[PDB]
Design a protein around this ligand. Structure first.
Ligand SMILES: Nc1ncnc2c1ncn2[C@@H]1O[C@H](COP(=O)(O)OP(=O)(O)OP(=O)(O)O)[C@@H](O)[C@H]1O
Ligand SMILES: [Mg+2]
Lengths: 384, 51, 71, 52
């Protein structure tokens, strides 16, 4: 509340920015200057009308190339060479001239149905310390992932290699999956996120080819963070056994070794791995000396769940009947996804009565339904 | 007259060289558009006044 | 490259009919048993050919496609 | 809050999306050798391969 002041100031400068841009473009982006008028005369002399697309197979070092078009016919093209002969390379999409096919130019920036999967389709709306609690070992993920980007200064004093990589593990409900997306908010480095059940395919050999791509994209952004969600899902998952099986699993692990480091010597990629099965992996990635600090997380204890529950109930309309500390008291060393689930079910009981105030009864009755899921997910009930 | 003369101008339309349905991948602010013709490939080509 | 005429449906066939220019070769007498299934194949084929409207008057959903399966 | 959401899209739309194209400042004349590659046949070649 009274976050008004922010919204006004940001909005007002945006209004002026829209104004300035519109007016700047029209009639005072002068097409009447001689540096614009004389430049386009002799540019279009070789630049089309239709500019037949090619795909660049290889160049020859005489100012030539051999293109294969997507349409069909290959062509032995020259190069107009005001696009700087040494600036293009195989895999690029090229502009050819429609009288005789010469490389007028080169398009840069592409997209594929294979980097569609990687790229983000959201920007997180829950930022840091919505994972609050269990914050006593968040210091080995904010001093090897965030910091060398934030200060290269402190790693200049020591010199040698900076920290690369973390692996997060513990029981589920320690917030790993959102933690990865929250340290990304702070650094402002290109955050790719790829699920590990999409590094398992129902076809063979094309798995390693998908995984090889992922880090080449990332090093192209000079800073990126790659989160592999569930990298224990490439060592338990398979489709059919004649294009999956042991072999498909086996190869992708080996591939990811070269990608994490190997020979390539690519740009800076910070890596975040969340896992909880850390024995289905090669003993060539879970050694220290690649993924530097390994972080253990334990179920939140009595005092920690006090930290967790103030995160979730600030969005709620608390009554004075509500006692937060007795909600904490009963449970004994249990998950923090449970606390998130009880608050969701508390607003569902509040909606069942139809009231947008959340009352104490709704939390305290929803607690028992949550506890019925631990005491009859094992039908033994009280241990036998 | 209306009936006999619609035929002659209509000859032009019938004797046209090709049509070819495309789709815009993307514009460029160089006042050309990247268009993928659907039976054929991609051409970057200049626009008319309507659009 | 313009539309200069139209063509009837009948013409421009993949192949001409075999059922009012030829006559199927196997009769229903050369089928032995599967009598339970024979009550069904005359439900599936024969009744929508002579008249679709029998179904309509009841108001029961027609059968559409015929699937034959088996080893 | 909703006015902010609306104006970001507006700024983006008016700036426009464009396709980056490479250049070279030491080429201010390129139709001293561009014109030779252009307009007649000297030729860009249908690539083939000897089979026998
Ligand atoms: N210890 C915690 N404190 C606060 N919120 C938590 C905690 N653990 C989980 N959550 C919440 O639970 C939701 C999902 O958790 P997330 O997917 O980030 O965790 P995870 O540890 O990878 O595994 P899981 O999803 O199985 O719990 C989010 O709303 C997140 O904020
Ligand atoms: Mg999880």
């Amino acid at each position: 509340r009274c976050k008004l002041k922010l919204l006004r100031m940001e909005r007002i400068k945006d209004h002026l920015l829209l104004e300035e841009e519109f007016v700047s473009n029209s009639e005072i982006l002068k097409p009447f200057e001689k540096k614009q008028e004389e430049e386009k005369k002799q540019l279009e002399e070789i630049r089309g009308n239709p500019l037949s697309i090619g795909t660049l197979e290889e160049i020859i070092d005489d100012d030539h190339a051999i293109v294969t078009s997507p349409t069909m016919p290959d062509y032995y093209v020259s190069i107009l060479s005001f696009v700087d002969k040494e600036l293009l390379e195989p895999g690029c999409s090229v502009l050819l001239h429609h009288k005789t096919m010469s490389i007028v130019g080169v398009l840069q920036d592409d997209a594929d149905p294979m980097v569609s999967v990687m790229k983000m389709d959201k920007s997180p709306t829950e930022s840091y310390s919505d994972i609050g609690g269990l914050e006593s070992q968040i210091q080995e993920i904010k001093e090897s992932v965030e910091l060398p980007l934030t200060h290269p200064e402190l790693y200049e004093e020591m010199g040698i290699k900076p920290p690369k990589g973390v692996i997060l593990y513990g029981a589920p409900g320690t917030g790993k999956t959102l933690l990865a997306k929250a340290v990304a908010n702070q650094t402002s480095a290109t955050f790719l996120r790829i699920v590990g059940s999409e590094l398992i395919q129902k076809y063979l050999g094309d798995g390693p080819r998908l995984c090889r791509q992922i880090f080449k994209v990332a090093g192209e952004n000079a800073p990126s963070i790659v989160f592999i969600d569930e990298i224990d899902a490439i060592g338990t998952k398979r489709y059919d056994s004649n294009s999956g099986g042991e072999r498909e699993i086996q190869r992708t692990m080996l591939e990811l070794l070269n990608q994490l480091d190997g020979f390539d010597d690519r740009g800076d990629v910070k890596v975040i791995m969340a896992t909880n099965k850390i024995e289905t992996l090669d003993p060539a990635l879970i050694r220290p000396g690649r993924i530097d600090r390994k972080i253990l997380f334990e179920n939140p204890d009595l005092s920690t769940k006090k930290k967790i529950l103030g995160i979730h109930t600030s969005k709620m309309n608390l009554s004075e009947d509500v006692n937060l500390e007795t909600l904490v008291t009963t449970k004994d060393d249990l998950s923090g996804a449970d606390i998130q689930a009880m608050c969701t079910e508390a607003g569902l009981l509040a909606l069942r009565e139809r009231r947008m105030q959340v009352t104490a009864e709704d939390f305290k009755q929803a607690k028992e339904r949550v506890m019925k899921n631990k005491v009859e997910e094992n039908l033994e009930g009280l241990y036998l | 007259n209306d009936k006999v003369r619609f035929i002659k101008d209509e000859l032009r339309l019938l004797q046209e060289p090709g049509s070819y349905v495309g789709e815009v991948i993307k514009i460029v602010s160089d006042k050309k558009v990247l268009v993928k013709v659907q039976p054929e490939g991609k051409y970057i080509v200049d626009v008319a006044k309507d659009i | 490259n313009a539309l200069v005429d139209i063509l009837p449906p009948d013409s421009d066939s993949s192949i001409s009919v075999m059922g009012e220019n030829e006559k199927p070769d196997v009769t229903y007498a050369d089928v032995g048993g599967l009598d339970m299934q024979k009550q069904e194949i005359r439900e599936a084929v024969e009744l929508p050919l002579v008249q679709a409207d029998l179904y309509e008057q009841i108001g029961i959903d027609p059968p559409r496609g015929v699937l034959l399966y088996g080893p | 809050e909703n006015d902010l959401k609306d104006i970001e899209a507006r700024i983006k739309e008016k700036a426009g999306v464009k396709e980056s194209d490479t250049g070279l400042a030491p080429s201010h004349l390129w139709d001293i050798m561009g014109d030779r590659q252009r307009l007649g046949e000297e030729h860009p070649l249908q690539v083939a391969r000897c089979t026998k």
